[PDB]
Amino acid sequence: QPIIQFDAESWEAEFTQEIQDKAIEGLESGSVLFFPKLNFPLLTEELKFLDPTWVSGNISYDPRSATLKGVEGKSEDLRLLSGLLKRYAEKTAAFLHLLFPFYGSSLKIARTSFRPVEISGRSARKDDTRLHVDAFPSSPTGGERILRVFSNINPQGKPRSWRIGEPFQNYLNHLLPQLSPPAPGKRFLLYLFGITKGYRSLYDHYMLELHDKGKLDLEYQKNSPQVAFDFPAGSTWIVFTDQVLHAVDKGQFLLEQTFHLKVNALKHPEKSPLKLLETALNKKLVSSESFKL
Ligand SMILES: [Fe+3]
């Protein structure tokens, strides 16, 4: 069940335990949780930002530090834009705490993003029209999960077209023969040189290889099992993007919020990419891992 549909229409929705169960089981199994009626409204004063020219170098906001990046302009405009992204951070965070009480306080918010550039007009590694799991060369996770909340805020009713691929285990299996260990010492140099933020764990190395090799595998991109789904304007969806194979084909105006979650906070840690990779390669893939006696 690549997509599980939910009825919630409010960011302050109260959830029964049955729906909370459905959500966590689905999320952890690598489904997209889809909320067709959960719209994220904009203030009249924010409507001006529905314009791709605000991107100056893909605008980001760090709720932890209340800092906005990737955009230039007058102070008042940056203030408004920061307010928009801040509100998205707040609402998504509240919603996740209402929906996933099992995770308790283990949900750690990360960066908020506003994507006002049209997708259809968009290197092979960066081509997000190619199925991939999320892995960022400059930003290793150390095994932590990448959980994202997305909202289509297109004011012309245009959907956001995605493709959803096969389960992670199948993707990993398909690509296994192409995986290779890192060159000795190379990850340490990336760290010393500031190319990576923190040290790239072996887990991160392998997720990057899956991401990259998968994107270059043209036969796989073309022929692997995948479903095309249009997320309507005014909808929201929630995905472990390090586990769900995904690609975006068209659309414009998206808010996105990243959260991180430690593997030991999961209901079924064995389903995580970290544990699946550690099992497949029979080794510990993050050196900083906690040790269970
Ligand atoms: Fe992605």
Q: Please write down the HEC assignment for all residues of 23-64.
A: HHHHHHCCCEEEECCCCCCCCHHHHHHCCHHHECCCEEEECC
- Listed in sequence order, the DSSP H helices in 59-201 are 75-99, 168-175, 186-192
- Specify the residue for token string 């192409």: 178
Query: Count H helices, E strands: the chain?
Result: 7, 11
Q: Give the distance (Å) from ligand 1 centre to CA of residue 239.
A: 10
CB atoms within 10 A of CB 177: 8
What distance lies between CA 217 and its chain's CA centroid?
22
Start-to-end CA span in the chain (Å)? 36
How far apart CA 81 and CA 219 sit, in angstroms, is 42
Q: What is the resolution of this structure in A?
A: 1.5
Tell me the pairing of strands 59-62 and 236-240.
unpaired
Tokens standing for 204? 């991160």
Tokens standing for 163? 């493709």
Q: Give the distance (Å) from ligand 1 centre to CA of residue 189.
A: 26
Single-letter amino acid, residue 146: I
Q: Which helix (H) or strand (E) holds 257?
A: strand 254-261
> Which residues line ion ligand 1, judged by CB < 5 Å?
134
Q: Rounded to the nearest 5 degrees, what angle is found at the Cα of 27, between the Cα atoms of 284 and 82?
A: 95
DSSP secondary structure string for all residues of 240-256:
ETTTS-EEEEE---EEE
How far apart CA 147 and CA 109 sit, in angstroms, is 9
Q: Return all residues near 130 (Cβ < 8 A) that are at least 6 apart.
A: 124, 214, 215, 221, 247
- Specify the residue for token string 């997209």: 32
Measured CA distances, 201 to 23, 24, 109, 110 (Å): 30, 27, 21, 19
Q: Give the distance (Å) from ligand 1 centre to CA of residue 245.
A: 8
How far apart CA 114 and CA 54 sit, in angstroms, is 10
DSSP letter, residue 12: T
Q: For residues 3 and 163, is the Cβ–Cβ distance under 8 A?
A: no
- Listed in sequence order, the DSSP H helices in 29-153 are 75-99
Q: Give the distance (Å) from ligand 1 centre to CA of residue 291.
A: 31
Tell me the binding residues. Answer: 115, 132, 134, 148, 160, 162, 246
State the method: X-ray
Tokens standing for 134? 């999320």
Q: Give the distance (Å) from ligand 1 centre to CA of residue 251.
A: 15
Strand intervals (E) in 119-179 = 145-152, 160-164
Q: Give the distance (Å) from ligand 1 centre to CA of residue 75.
A: 31
Q: Give the distance (Å) from ligand 1 centre to CA of residue 133.
A: 6
Q: For residues 33 and 92, is the Cβ–Cβ distance under 8 A?
A: no
**What 3-state class would DSSP assign to 198?**
coil
Q: For residues 128 and 122, is the Cβ–Cβ distance under 8 A?
A: yes
- Specify the residue for token string 């929906």: 99
